[PDB]
C-alpha cells in the first residue's frame, strides 16, 4: 500500500534496541530506498538505479546482531542471516558462497523473483580479513577466498544456486538467480582496528626534543577512533580494496555506558529483568528491583568490557543461591533485591504471607 | 508432572561427586531453569528467555568430566559430549563444528525438535586458546579459528547437517537445527591462568623508595585464585573477548585433600574400593579395608601428583600378587588389608572358613 517512513522503522527498533542512532538511520534509509526501488519495478526512468550496501563496525555486545534479528520482525521481503566463518570458496569441502542464496530461497518458497528483491545479512566479516604478516605463498580459502568470491555476488552477478545447497556437482542442474538488486549487509567487531586508526591519525610517537609528547589520558576513546574510519585503514586490517569498494556505506556503533546500560535492564521488550521477573512469576513468586542496584550492576558490567552480555553474568551470580533453594521454601509471595545484595554484603529480602 | 528441584538434583550428583558444592549449584540451577523454559513456549507474558552457558574451570581429576557424565543419568533430554581439539575451521580436513550437532541427533533418533532443546557439553576448551598468536602471523584452524566458528553457534543460528549423510543429491533437505535454545557447557583445565590472576591481584605500583605501597602479598591456593577470575584474565590466556562474552556464568573447582580422597574411596556408589569388593564377592571371597590403609593411599596419591586417577594405580599394585593366585586356592572367606601392606613391608591377611 504505502512504504513506511524511516521514522516509523526507527521507532519500532527502539523498542528492542537502545541508542545507536546513526546505525538505525542508515538501516531505515536503506530499507526505505529498497522498498522504493521495488515499487518502481517497471523502471520507467531511463537511468538504472544502483544499490548501496551497508557495513557495520562496532564493539562486541553493541547490538549488531540484535539489529538484524529485530529488522526481520518488521521486514516484509525475504531476509536471511549467514556466518562468514563457515563460508569457503568453490571447489572445497566447505560450503560455497552460493549456498547463502539457497537459504533465502527457502524463506520465499523457492521464488526467484522474491529472492532477487530479498535482503541478506552477514556476520563475522572481520574474521575473514587477510593476514598481512602471512606470506602470499600459502593460499587462504577461509579469509581471502571468501572475499574474492563475494565481489561479483555483491556487485551483482548470475549465481547458479543449487536447489538444496548440500552439494554442487558440475553435471547437476542449478537454478539461475540474479543478484543485481539484492542487498547485502556485513557486520563484524574488528579487533585492533582502533590501533591502526590511532597510529595514522595521531602520529605522536617520538622521544626527541622536537617530537611532541602525548599523555595516555589524551588518547581518544575506542569509539571515537572508530568514527574516523576510512577504507585505507580497513585495508591494513586485511581486507582487499575490491571488497571494501563494494561497500560504500559505512556505519559505526558506540560503546555502551552506565546510563545507557541501566535502560537495557528495563526499557527493552525482552530485557534481562523482564526475563527474570517472568521466570519467577511462573513459580508463584514476585520479583522487584531497585534503581540503585541497576546502577551498581551496570558499573560492574562495564569493568568486564564484554558489552551487554556482561549484565547476564552479574545477575546470575547474585541470584545463584536464590534459585538453588527457591522452590524448596514455602509461603513466599515476593522477593526484593537490595543494593547491598549485589555487593555481596546481604541476601535477598524474602516476603512471606 | 513436576520438575525436580535443585536440592534433589544436587543429592544425586553429591553421590558421585565430593566437595563441589559451588559447581553442583550452578549445574542444578541451569537444568532446572532449562526445564522451565521447555514447559512454556516463551513465557505467560510472551517474552523469550535468553540462555546462559556455563564455563567450568578446574584442575585435572577434579570431576569436570565426571559431572557431565553423571548429569546425563538424570537428564530427560538428549545429551552429548564433544572434543574441541578435533574441531577445525571450515574447508579443512579436521572435523567440522557442525558435526557436534549431528551427534546430538543420533541420541534422539534424528529428531530435530528434540535436539533443539538438548544439552551439549564441551571438554578441554583451553586447548583451542591462542598461544601468543596476537600478531596473527598465520591463521590457526585448531585454535582461534575454532573460537570464531563457535561465536554464532553458541548464540543461536541455523545449522545445516545432513539427515542421513546426504542420501540422495536431489531433494537433500539438509536438517536445519536452530541452537538458540540449546544449552552449552564448556570445561577445561587451564595451566598458567593462576599466575595471570596472581599477577593482577599482586599489588605494587613501582620499585624503590618512591613506591608508596609495600606490595605485600600472601600465598593463596589454586582454587582461591580461580574464584577471583574475571573475563580480562581469560583474554590474556588467548581467548577472544567475544567468545567469553557468550558464557556469562563461570564456575570454578578446587583441588582434593586426604579427607576428600578418603571419602571418594568409599562414599560414592561406584567407588574404587567398592568395585574391587564386587569383583571379589562374585568369587566367594569377602574383602575389607581399614582407615589407616586409606590414609596411606590418600597420602601416596597426593604425593605423586597424579590426582584421583592415581588411586587405582596404588590399589591394583597392592593387590596384584593377591589376585594373581587367588583363583588357584580355595576355602578363603575374607581378606583384610592393613597399612603396612600398602607400604610394601607386609602382605594381606587371609581368613579361611
Amino acid at each position: 500500500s504505502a512504504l513506511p517512513t524511516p521514522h516509523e522503522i526507527r521507532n519500532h527498533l527502539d523498542d528492542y534496541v537502545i541508542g545507536q542512532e546513526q546505525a538505525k538511520k542508515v538501516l531505515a534509509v536503506a530499507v526505505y530506498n529498497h522498498y522504493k526501488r521495488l515499487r518502481n519495478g517497471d523502471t520507467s526512468n531511463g537511468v538504472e538505479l544502483g544499490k548501496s550496501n551497508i557495513l557495520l563496525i562496532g564493539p562486541t555486545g553493541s547490538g549488531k546482531t540484535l539489529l538484524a534479528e529485530t529488522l526481520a520482525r518488521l521486514l516484509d521481503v525475504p531476509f536471511t542471516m549467514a556466518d562468514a566463518t563457515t563460508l569457503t570458496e568453490a571447489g572445497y569441502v566447505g560450503e560455497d558462497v552460493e549456498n547463502i542464496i539457497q537459504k533465502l530461497l527457502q524463506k520465499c518458497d523457492y521464488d526467484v523473483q522474491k529472492a532477487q528483491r530479498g535482503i541478506v545479512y552477514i556476520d563475522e566479516i572481520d574474521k575473514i580479513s587477510r593476514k598481512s604478516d602471512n606470506p602470499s605463498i600459502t593460499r587462504d580459502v577461509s579469509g581471502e577466498g571468501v572475499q574474492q568470491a563475494l565481489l561479483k555476488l555483491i556487485e551483482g552477478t548470475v549465481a547458479a544456486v543449487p536447489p538444496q545447497g548440500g552439494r554442487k556437482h558440475p553435471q547437476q542442474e542449478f537454478l539461475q538467480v540474479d543478484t543485481s538488486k539484492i542487498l547485502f549487509i556485513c557486520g563484524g567487531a574488528f579487533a585492533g582496528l582502533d590501533k591502526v586508526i590511532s597510529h595514522r591519525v595521531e602520529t605522536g610517537s617520538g622521544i626527541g626534543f622536537g617530537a611532541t609528547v602525548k599523555a595516555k589520558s589524551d588518547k581518544a576513546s575506542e569509539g571515537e577512533l572508530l568514527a574516523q574510519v576510512e577504507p585505507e585503514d580497513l585495508i591494513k586490517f586485511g581486507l582487499i580494496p575490491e571488497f571494501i569498494g563494494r561497500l560504500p556505506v559505512v556505519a559505526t556503533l558506540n560503546e555502551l555506558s552506565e546510563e545507557a546500560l541501566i535502560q537495557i535492564l528495563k526499557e527493552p521488550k525482552n530485557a534481562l529483568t523482564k526475563q527474570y521477573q517472568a521466570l519467577f512469576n511462573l513459580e508463584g513468586v514476585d520479583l522487584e528491583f531497585r534503581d540503585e542496584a541497576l546502577d551498581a550492576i551496570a558499573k560492574k558490567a562495564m569493568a568486564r568490557k564484554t558489552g551487554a552480555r556482561g549484565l547476564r553474568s552479574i545477575v546470575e551470580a547474585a541470584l545463584l543461591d536464590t534459585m538453588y533453594d527457591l522452590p524448596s521454601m514455602e509461603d513466599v509471595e515476593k522477593v526484593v533485591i537490595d543494593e547491598s545484595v549485589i555487593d555481596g554484603q546481604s541476601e535477598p529480602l524474602l516476603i512471606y504471607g | 508432572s513436576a520438575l525436580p528441584t535443585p536440592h534433589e538434583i544436587r543429592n544425586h550428583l553429591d553421590d558421585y561427586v565430593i566437595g563441589q558444592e559451588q559447581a553442583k549449584k550452578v549445574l542444578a540451577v541451569a537444568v532446572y531453569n532449562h526445564y522451565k523454559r521447555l514447559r512454556n513456549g516463551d513465557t505467560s507474558n510472551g517474552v523469550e528467555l535468553g540462555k546462559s552457558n556455563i564455563l567450568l574451570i578446574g584442575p585435572t581429576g577434579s570431576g569436570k568430566t565426571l559431572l557431565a557424565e553423571t548429569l546425563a543419568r538424570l537428564l530427560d533430554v538428549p545429551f552429548t559430549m564433544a572434543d574441541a581439539t578435533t574441531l577445525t575451521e571450515a574447508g579443512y580436513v579436521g572435523e567440522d563444528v557442525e558435526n557436534i550437532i549431528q551427534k546430538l541427533l543420533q541420541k534422539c533418533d534424528y529428531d530435530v525438535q528434540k535436539a533443539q532443546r538438548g544439552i551439549v557439553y564441551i571438554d578441554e576448551i583451553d586447548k583451542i586458546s591462542r598461544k601468543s598468536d596476537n600478531p596473527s602471523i598465520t591463521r590457526d584452524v585448531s585454535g582461534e579459528g575454532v573460537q570464531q566458528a563457535l561465536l554464532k553457534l553458541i548464540e543461536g543460528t541455523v545449522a545445516a547437517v545432513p539427515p542421513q549423510g546426504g542420501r540422495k543429491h536431489p531433494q537433500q533437505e539438509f536438517l536445519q537445527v536452530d541452537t538458540s535454545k540449546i544449552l552449552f557447557i564448556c570445561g577445561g583445565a587451564f595451566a598458567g591462568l593462576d599466575k595471570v590472576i596472581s599477577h593482577r591481584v599482586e599489588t605494587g605500583s613501582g620499585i624503590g623508595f618512591g613506591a608508596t605501597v609495600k606490595a605485600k602479598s600472601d600465598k593463596a591456593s589454586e582454587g582461591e585464585l580461580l574464584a577471583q577470575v574475571e573475563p580480562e584474565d581469560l583474554i590474556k590466556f588467548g581467548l577472544i573477548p567475544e567468545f567469553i562474552g557468550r558464557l556469562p556464568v563461570v564456575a570454578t573447582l578446587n583441588e582434593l585433600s586426604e579427607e576428600a580422597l578418603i571419602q571418594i574411596l568409599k562414599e560414592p556408589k561406584n567407588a574404587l574400593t567398592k568395585q574391587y569388593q564386587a569383583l571379589f564377592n562374585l568369587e566367594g571371597v569377602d574383602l575389607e579395608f581399614r582407615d589407616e590403609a586409606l590414609d596411606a593411599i590418600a597420602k601416596k596419591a597426593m604425593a605423586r601428583k597424579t590426582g584421583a586417577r592415581g588411586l587405582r594405580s596404588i590399589v591394583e599394585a597392592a593387590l596384584l600378587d593377591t589376585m594373581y593366585d587367588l583363583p588357584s586356592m580355595e576355602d578363603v572367606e575374607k581378606v583384610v588389608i592393613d597399612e603396612s601392606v600398602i607400604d610394601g613391608q607386609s602382605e594381606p591377611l587371609l581368613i579361611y572358613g
Partner: peptide, 11 residues
C-alpha cells in the same frame, strides 16, 4: 535404493 542416486562424485 541400494545404489547411490549419483554414481559420479566430485572431490
Amino acid at each position: 535404493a541400494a545404489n547411490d542416486e549419483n554414481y559420479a562424485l566430485a572431490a
